[model samples]
Target: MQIFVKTLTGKTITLEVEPSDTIENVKAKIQDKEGIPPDQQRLIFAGKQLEDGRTLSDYNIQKESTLHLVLRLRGG
Candidate 1:
């Protein structure tokens, strides 16, 4: 299946994923594609945060799912 991860600034990233893939696995892909670390990337779907240990299937993430990615700042 294919999913889209969009940034706060409107940048969209396309990702190929499977239902069995964990949220962390998705972050790793973002890390590889966009150079954003998993620790700093937040994935939100349907206004709920995606947990690292949870699978995409667990969240009912389907094809064409658009997940919002919020970048976390390291320091204030």
Candidate 2:
């Protein structure tokens, strides 16, 4: 399935992923295309923050779903 994401920069990016693909996997892909490290990414959908080690199906993600991406805050 393909999911659309809204980045902090206001760009909408499309990501193709399988139902069985982990959120971590998606983050990795985001890292590849957006130059943001997976660790620095905070993916949100349905008003919830996406978690690693979980597949897309676990989050009940459907086709054309929109994920909002934010960068994690760095602690000093």
Candidate 3:
């Protein structure tokens, strides 16, 4: 399955991930692509924290789904 991922910096990346891939896995991929750490990344969907270890199916992600991944910024 393919998914569209967007970062808080307004960067969009399309990933071809398997249906078995978990949200955590997606986070790792985003970190690798965006050059950001997993801890520093925040996966928000519908304005809520995406639970760790949850599979894309668990989150109701269908084929060619798009998810918004925001990079968490601190120390304002």
Candidate 4:
């Protein structure tokens, strides 16, 4: 299934993933497309935060679900 990752800057990234895909898996994809490290990404869906160890299925994510990406502040 395909899901969406929306950034605060209004940029949208569309990703193809399975229900078995973990949040870390999704973050890896985001890292590839956006150049942000997986550890720097915080994904939110359905008003809840997604954990790296958790699968999309665990959150009941469905096709076309939109996940919001909040970037963790980097140390200067």
TM-score, ranked from best to worst: 1, 4, 2, 3
Residue 36, model 1: lDDT of 84
Q: How many clashing residue pairs appear in each of the predictions shown?
A: 0, 0, 0, 0
| Residue runs of model 4 more than 4 Å from their true location after superposition | 74-76
Alpha-carbon local distance difference test for all models? 0.90, 0.87, 0.76, 0.89
lDDT score for candidate 2 against the true structure: 0.87
Any runs in candidate 2 off by more than 4 Å, and if so which? 73-76
Judge candidate 3 at residue 10 and give its lDDT.
85
Q: Which should have the higher TM-score, number 1 or number 4? A: 1
lDDT of 1 by residue, 1-76 (tens): 8999888899898999899999999989888888888989889998879899999999988999899999996555
Candidate 2: tens digits of C-alpha lDDT, residues 1-76: 8899997799899988788879999999888877888888888987789898998899888899889998886456
Worst 10 residues of 4 by lDDT: 39-48
Once superposed on the true structure, which residue ranges of model 3 sit more than 4 Å away at CA? 73-76
lDDT tens string, model 3, 1-76? Answer: 7788776678778877776777788778877776777777777777788876988888888876767887666445
Superposed Cα RMSD, model 2: 1.6
Model 2, residue pairs in steric clash: none
